[PDB]
DNA sequence: AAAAAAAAAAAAAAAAAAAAAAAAAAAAAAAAAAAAAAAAAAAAAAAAAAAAAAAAAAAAAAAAAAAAAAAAAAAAAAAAAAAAAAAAAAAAAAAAAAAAAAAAAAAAAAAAAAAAAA
């Protein structure tokens, strides 16, 4: 897509754990995973960084 | 023959070092277990190969979570001042091969001496 290019990382997570992500240019963040709903292997949703 | 420096007399100031003996620790150098790594054998799971198949991307289309707009408000990060940590550049150095000067052994031959023959 215009926004999405290449799949990067896959992490298994429960419904109350956080996902910390990093960017190549000295940027990161810590997000709560409650606010995103599972979907069936075909879709694009929420931009977190 | 003039200048300069060493050394020695005797009361003063002030320092430095080598070993013995026992018992414990701390460096520092070795054999020797012990496991990576590598060479050279047989051996055996994976790709190949082929036929056969059915599970998920297309396609229609609603709708429901969404990313831009608007607003208010909090305050992370960036650049400018200073103040420390830590590493190349350059120069210096102590043993260390090279050279030169003095001590001990060497015999050739003779002065002086000691000793004895007729």
Instruction: Give dist(CA A42, CA A14) in Å, integer.
Output: 20
Beta bridge partners of A32: A18
- A18-27 long-range contacts, CB within 8 A, separation 24+: A19/A48, A21/A48, A21/A49, A23/A49
Resolution value in angstroms:
3.0
Do the beta carbons of residue A48 and residue A31 sit within 8 Å? yes
Q: Which residues touch strand B (CB under 7 A)?
A: A 36-37, 41-42, 45-47
Please report, rounded to whole angstroms, the spatial distance between the CA atom of protein residue A10 and the C1' atom of nucleotide B96. Answer: 68
Taking the CA of residue A48 and the C1' sugar atom of nucleotide B5, their distance in angstroms comes to: 95
Residue A28 CA distance to nucleotide B77 C1' (Å): 14
């Amino acid at each position: 897509r215009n926004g999405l290019v290449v799949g990067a990382v896959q992490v298994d997570d429960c419904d109350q754990i956080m996902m910390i992500t990093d960017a190549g240019t000295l940027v990161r963040t810590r997000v709560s995973e409650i606010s995103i709903v599972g979907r069936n292997t075909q879709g694009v949703i929420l931009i977190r960084t």
